[PDB]
Design a binder for this molecule. Structure first.
Ligand SMILES: O=C(O)c1cccc(-c2ccccc2O)c1
Ligand SMILES: [Cl-]
Length: 242
């Protein structure tokens, strides 16, 4: 069911890094990784939490739809794309933390906790501040646990409405061409050691879906582009994409 290929470590070590890639073949129900231990080690989800956070906000009516505008609060932040109005689509695309912090405040501790347990999401622990627990609180999730959660979402099996799941999968759209579609979300965790980057999602092909979840050491922001680049190079090596 699970195969470990330590030779794939070269994708990380050739960049003076270390990490894990996890792939799941939905048709064959088989998994692949370079490191079974790290595949099951739990990290802060950071901005990959925008997937469950969006689902909860939509299902509770905190967010009406993907067109509702979340007005910039007029506080100048150091990420230029955050200093503007957003909807769910662009908020996901630009990982706009302050918009999702307000989502969490309106969701509230009790409903957030209950929904994460319903999702079987990571350690389901929201200890910390309700508006930042996914950045510096107690919640943790592994690469394999991300795959499990994403598979439920793909099949509309999460305990929210079909509509909420369709909207979030629309907002996850990252790349599409004549050969494949990628729906995914990046993450960048810096507040608690070790600093890492995430990329989790899936690749849609004509007759199969390949789920993926990766994290990697990220001592500085200079390496953030390696999250997607390394993953796609693994996918290309395994003949999942051209
Ligand atoms: O991963 C991104 O594409 C992304 C999106 C938004 C912000 C940042 C970021 C980069 C450096 C330091 C802090 C950040 O919050 C990174
Ligand atoms: Cl779509």
């Amino acid at each position: 069911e699970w195969q470990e290929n330590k030779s794939w470590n070269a994708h990380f070590t050739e960049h003076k890094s270390q990490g894990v890639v996890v792939l799941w073949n939905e048709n064959k129900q088989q998994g692949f990784t370079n490191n079974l231990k790290r595949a099951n080690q739990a990290f802060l989800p950071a901005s990959t939490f925008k997937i469950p956070n969006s689902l909860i906000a939509l299902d509770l009516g905190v967010v009406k739809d993907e067109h509702q505008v979340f007005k910039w609060d007029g506080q100048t932040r150091d990420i230029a794309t955050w200093n503007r109005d957003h909807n769910l689509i662009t908020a996901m695309k630009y990982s706009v933390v302050p918009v999702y912090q307000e989502f969490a405040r309106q969701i509230g501790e009790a409903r957030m906790s209950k929904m994460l347990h319903a999702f079987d999401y990571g350690n389901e622990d929201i200890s910390g501040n309700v508006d930042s627990f996914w950045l510096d609180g107690g919640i943790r999730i592994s690469a394999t646990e991300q795959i499990s959660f994403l598979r439920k979402l793909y099949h509309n099996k999460l305990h929210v409405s079909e509509r909420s799941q369709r909207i979030v999968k629309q907002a996850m759209l990252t790349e599409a061409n004549g050969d494949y579609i990628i729906r995914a979300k990046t993450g960048y965790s810096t507040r608690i050691e070790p600093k890492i980057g995430w990329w989790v999602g899936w690749v849609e092909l004509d007759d199969n879906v390949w789920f993926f979840a990766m994290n990697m050491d990220m001592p500085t922001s200079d390496g953030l582009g390696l999250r997607q680049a390394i993953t796609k190079e693994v996918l290309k090596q395994e003949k999942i994409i051209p």
